[PDB]
Amino acid sequence: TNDTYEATYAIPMHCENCVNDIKACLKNVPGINSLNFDIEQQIMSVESSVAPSTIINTLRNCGKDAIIRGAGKPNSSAVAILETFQKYTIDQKKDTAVRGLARIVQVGENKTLFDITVNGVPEAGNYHASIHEKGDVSKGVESTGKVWHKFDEPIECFNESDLGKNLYSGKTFLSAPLPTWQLIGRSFVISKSLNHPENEPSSVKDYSFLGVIARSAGVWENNKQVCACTGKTVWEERKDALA
Amino acid sequence: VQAVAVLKGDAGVSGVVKFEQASESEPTTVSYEIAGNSPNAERGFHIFEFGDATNGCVSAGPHFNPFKKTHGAPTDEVRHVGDMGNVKTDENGVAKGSFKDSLIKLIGPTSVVGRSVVIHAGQDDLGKGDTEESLKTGNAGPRPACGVIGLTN
Numbered sequence A: 001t002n003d004t005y006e007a008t009y010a011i012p013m014h015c016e017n018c019v020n021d022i023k024a025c026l027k028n029v030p031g032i033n034s035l036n037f038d039i040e041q042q043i044m045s046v047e048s049s050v051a052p053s054t055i056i057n058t059l060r061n062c063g064k065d066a067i068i069r070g071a072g073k074p075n076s077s078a079v080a081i082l083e084t085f086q087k088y089t090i091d092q093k094k095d096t097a098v099r100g101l102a103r104i105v106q107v108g109e110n111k112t113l114f115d116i117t118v119n120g121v122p123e124a125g126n127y128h129a130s131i132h133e134k135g136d137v138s139k140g141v142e143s144t145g146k147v148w149h150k151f152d153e154p155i156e157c158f159n160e161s162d163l164g165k166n167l168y169s170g171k172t173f174l175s176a177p178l179p180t181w182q183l184i185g186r187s188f189v190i191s192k193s194l195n196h197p198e199n200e201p202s203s204v205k206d207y208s209f210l211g212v213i214a215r216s217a218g219v220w221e222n223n224k225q226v227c228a229c230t231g232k233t234v235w236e237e238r239k240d241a242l243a
Numbered sequence B: 001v002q003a004v005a006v007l008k009g010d011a012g013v014s015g016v017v018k019f020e021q022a023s024e025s026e027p028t029t030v031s032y033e034i035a036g037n038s039p040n041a042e043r044g045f046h047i048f049e050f051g052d053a054t055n056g057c058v059s060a061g062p063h064f065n066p067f068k069k070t071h072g073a074p075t076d077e078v079r080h081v082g083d084m085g086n087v088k089t090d091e092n093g094v095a096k097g098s099f100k101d102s103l104i105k106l107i108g109p110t111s112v113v114g115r116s117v118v119i120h121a122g123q124d125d126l127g128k129g130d131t132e133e134s135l136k137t138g139n140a141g142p143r144p145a146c147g148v149i150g151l152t153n
């Protein structure tokens, strides 16, 4: 079981039993080689073959809220936020465009893990992930060129979404002999053939969301905490209240 | 080698940035067009170390600084390789221009492919300010739209 990678998650742990509960919360999660608690900087370093989502969710269902801050050797991990590039008749009027996330981690000289999550698709069903030639999302999936690699495990979206009472979600933990260096810069696409393409006022055939595969900070590689902003005006705030 | 980043963001600012570079040694040519910006003004324009936005600005890290230096202007010698200074905007809030850089590269160990491009809501003080702050971000304030640099053509 070489497919292990190290990840660091920030979780508050400055209470009497905080750590013990985390230790407890993950005790049954198969696939975890080790946990390290740096109580000082309140960070949990985790060695495993598990999907980051698994770690983050197992903890959520236990009230503990963890925030991943790094994963893998530097330059061994990537992230791809999956968004739609047009609105569908089946989407909701006031929705944003995010639909899923592909968190990539290299675990072998030639083998990377893919923690694919989809939360909130309007049409239940089996979606298909694949990596496309280009990381150009200027014209949606069209501007991404031909397929670079097609995954086979489907992404079953039938579970109920915490977002909407009738939205769906899914997840799938794939693995491919694709090194991270050939992945970054390209695009990750998840799409399904629409059940009724007839109802979309456009030549649209598939319901798809994608994103360019970006570089993610490796374990202990990024310590940015906050960031620049301005404002917080009361006179500005009033004008907004009386528009 | 060609790259491109599409700038989006819930701020009404949006646009596209293109990169061209024949060989690692030769300079990269940056081309850009961005609407939604304030009219007749200057806006910061940096390349962050990561493209990961799973946590916004934070997950993106600081300005891509492979050579461990301080914040500066594209002109200055001492600068983060991701310091593209300020882009000017016409009377319609549209910034349109191009330039060449010798530090920014689409090839080799310092490739910016996969990292993100951002445009701020304020003017970049190019590190010519007082504060330590100035030598870090340059005080360009908030960042209304960004994007990941991806391979293309």
Ligand SMILES: [Zn+2]
Residues within 6 Å of the ligand: A014
């Ligand atoms: Zn404390």
Ligand SMILES: [Zn+2]
Residues within 6 Å of the ligand: B046, B063, B070, B071, B072, B079, B080, B082, B083, B136, B137, B138
């Ligand atoms: Zn800088």
